Amino acid sequence: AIRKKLVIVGDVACGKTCLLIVFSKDQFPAVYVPTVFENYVADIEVDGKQVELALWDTAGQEDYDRARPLSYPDTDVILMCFSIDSPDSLENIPEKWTPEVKHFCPNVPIILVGNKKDLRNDEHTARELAKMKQEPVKPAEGRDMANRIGAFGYMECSAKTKDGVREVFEMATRAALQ
Ligand SMILES: Nc1nc2c(ncn2[C@@H]2O[C@H](COP(=O)(O)OP(=O)(O)O)[C@@H](O)[C@H]2O)c(=O)[nH]1
């Protein structure tokens, strides 16, 4: 049995938990999905191989700088997230999450994930961000940040529409494998 530890990080409310929830619910046979993910085993199949993905969610620990890192030992792949409706969450990628992850998880592959891609085209999130003189993150910006931080790859998804969720985990699994 091949088991890979996956830790997901990113700012508060950037969609980390909902991303795990949508993925866990896509499993078959259908299982009951809890609200917390700490060493939560998800069985996935990518390229014909059965893989056990142990999920670790740092949601609720974004401000526990000394406690949060205890979850990093022996991580096989990192899902570093930001929200497309929040350029502030993207700016924290190089300023907070990358230095931390690279320190505690050296040479561990990182998948830069842009959550809430369904909000990019939302008129309400466009107005709220305009008040702060901001606008949704463009695909190009995400791809550039991925290159800058040396991520294995960049993926966009939406936990709400489920678009791109499957692909995020397939890429994370391949990275953990290779
Ligand atoms: N529109 C939209 N809202 C989302 C999406 N994913 C999460 N959210 C919402 O964002 C809020 C916080 O994200 P959540 O995943 O619950 O927690 P986090 O662990 O702090 O990222 C909640 O109100 C969610 O319903 C998404 O793909 N699209």
Side-chain angles (χ1 to χ4, degrees):
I2 303 177
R3 195 175 305 159
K4 295 299 182 183
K5 174 175 175 173
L6 180 157
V7 183
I8 180 167
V9 308
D11 291 352
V12 174
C14 78
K16 302 180 300 299
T17 307
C18 283
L19 177 54
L20 297 190
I21 291 168
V22 173
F23 168 66
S24 302
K25 287 182 173 298
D26 184 74
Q27 282 186 88
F28 188 81
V31 298
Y32 172 62
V33 176
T35 56
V36 295
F37 304 84
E38 304 300 334
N39 187 225
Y40 172 96
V41 253
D43 299 286
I44 191 183
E45 187 196 5
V46 291
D47 304 326
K49 186 159 295 300
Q50 288 302 319
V51 181
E52 297 178 355
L53 230 50
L55 315 185
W56 291 73
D57 191 1
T58 58
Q61 300 175 248
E62 297 92 340
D63 286 330
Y64 299 161
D65 296 348
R66 298 173 298 175
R68 181 176 64 258
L70 281 47
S71 297
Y72 289 136
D74 305 295
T75 294
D76 296 290
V77 62
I78 296 285
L79 284 190
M80 194 183 290
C81 308
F82 71 87
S83 183
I84 289 176
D85 88 329
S86 178
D88 279 349
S89 66
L90 172 62
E91 188 52 34
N92 267 325
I93 294 297
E95 293 185 348
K96 180 180 185 178
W97 306 113
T98 297
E100 179 176 301
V101 166
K102 284 188 183 297
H103 175 254
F104 293 105
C105 307
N107 303 305
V108 174
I110 296 170
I111 303 298
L112 183 59
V113 181
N115 292 330
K116 313 186 185 186
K117 75 181 303 180
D118 58 287
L119 257 33
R120 173 172 281 133
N121 43 106
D122 191 71
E123 62 159 12
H124 180 66
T125 58
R127 301 175 189 187
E128 292 300 315
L129 290 188
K131 297 180 178 182
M132 301 302 293
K133 292 190 173 189
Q134 297 178 314
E135 65 178 305
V137 178
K138 312 178 194 296
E141 298 185 73
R143 289 192 293 252
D144 291 332
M145 187 62 79
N147 284 327
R148 176 184 163 190
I149 73 175
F152 184 83
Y154 175 64
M155 283 292 316
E156 296 197 326
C157 72
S158 173
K160 189 158 180 295
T161 77
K162 293 185 294 184
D163 184 45
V165 174
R166 175 64 198 193
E167 292 69 29
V168 167
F169 289 86
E170 291 195 302
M171 183 178 283
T173 303
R174 291 181 182 124
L177 244 34
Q178 306 173 324

PDB file of all heavy atoms in Angstrom, residues 14 42 58 139:
ATOM      1  N   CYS A  14      -9.488  30.822   2.736  1.00  0.00           N
ATOM      2  CA  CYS A  14      -9.132  30.761   1.317  1.00  0.00           C
ATOM      3  C   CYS A  14      -9.661  29.513   0.602  1.00  0.00           C
ATOM      4  O   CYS A  14      -9.368  29.295  -0.572  1.00  0.00           O
ATOM      5  CB  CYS A  14      -7.620  30.931   1.097  1.00  0.00           C
ATOM      6  SG  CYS A  14      -6.598  29.486   1.423  1.00  0.00           S
ATOM      7  N   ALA A  42      -7.725   9.095   2.357  1.00  0.00           N
ATOM      8  CA  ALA A  42      -8.547   9.173   1.172  1.00  0.00           C
ATOM      9  C   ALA A  42      -7.895   8.204   0.194  1.00  0.00           C
ATOM     10  O   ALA A  42      -6.676   8.167   0.080  1.00  0.00           O
ATOM     11  CB  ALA A  42      -8.536  10.583   0.617  1.00  0.00           C
ATOM     12  N   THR A  58      -4.602  22.564   7.831  1.00  0.00           N
ATOM     13  CA  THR A  58      -4.078  23.536   8.786  1.00  0.00           C
ATOM     14  C   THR A  58      -5.094  24.633   9.095  1.00  0.00           C
ATOM     15  O   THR A  58      -4.763  25.622   9.759  1.00  0.00           O
ATOM     16  CB  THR A  58      -2.761  24.192   8.293  1.00  0.00           C
ATOM     17  OG1 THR A  58      -2.983  24.830   7.030  1.00  0.00           O
ATOM     18  CG2 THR A  58      -1.647  23.156   8.167  1.00  0.00           C
ATOM     19  N   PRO A 139      -5.232  34.346 -14.106  1.00  0.00           N
ATOM     20  CA  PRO A 139      -4.534  33.070 -14.288  1.00  0.00           C
ATOM     21  C   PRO A 139      -3.028  33.236 -14.457  1.00  0.00           C
ATOM     22  O   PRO A 139      -2.246  32.458 -13.908  1.00  0.00           O
ATOM     23  CB  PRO A 139      -5.175  32.519 -15.561  1.00  0.00           C
ATOM     24  CG  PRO A 139      -6.569  33.030 -15.469  1.00  0.00           C
ATOM     25  CD  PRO A 139      -6.364  34.457 -15.043  1.00  0.00           C
TER      26      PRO A 139
END
